[PDB]
Amino acid sequence: MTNTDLKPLLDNLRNATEFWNLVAAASAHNRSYRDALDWLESAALALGDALIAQRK
Amino acid sequence: TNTDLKPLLDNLRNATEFWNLVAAASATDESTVHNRSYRDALDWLESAALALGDALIAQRKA
């Protein structure tokens, strides 16, 4: 869609990815693991649903 | 950078449309069918989310 629409949704997904990656790098479950998984799923779905909605 | 992002966004959009389909189907799917589809929809959501997220992390590094 739009650069300004994306930005906050991309930011949330990047933070969720960076968190998930760090939770993964430390075990190589936790309340942090579950919050990271939930935040990753929630940011993925929010950006996916936003991409769906903007393509009419 | 929309050319770098477009294949990652398309992949995430499609995984979400599939996930939304698995959700609509769970109202009538047998529970064995649902667990399999949901696991598959979750794994595609995750790998699509992470592939775009890793690319945003790598591009923020500039």
Keywords:
homodimer; mainly alpha; 56 residues; elongated
Helix content of chain A: over 70%
- E-strand count of chain A: 0
Number of helices in the DSSP assignment of chain A = 2
Shape of chain A: elongated
Largest sheet of chain A: none
| Domains of chain A (count) | 1
Secondary-structure content class of chain A: mainly alpha
Order of helices and strands of chain A: HH
Q: What share of the residues of chain A does DSSP label as strand, in percent?
A: under 5%
- How far do the termini of chain A sit from each other? 11 Å
The rounded Rg of chain A comes to 13 Å
Instruction: Determine the most extensive contact between two protein chains.
Output: A-B, 19 and 20 residues
Model description:
The structure is a homodimer. Chain A has 56 residues and is mainly α. The first copy, chain A, contains two helices and no strands. The first copy, chain A, has one domain (3-54). The first copy, chain A, has helices at residues 3-27, 31-54. In chain A, α1 runs antiparallel to α2 (31-54). The longest helix of chain A has 25 residues, at 3-27. The radius of gyration of chain A is 13 Å and the shape is elongated.
Task: Write a concise synopsis of the structure shown.
Two copies of one chain form a homodimer. Chain A is built from two helices and no strands.
Outline the fold blueprint.
The structure is a homodimer.
Chain A: H1 3-27, H2 31-54
Helix pairs in contact in A: 1-2
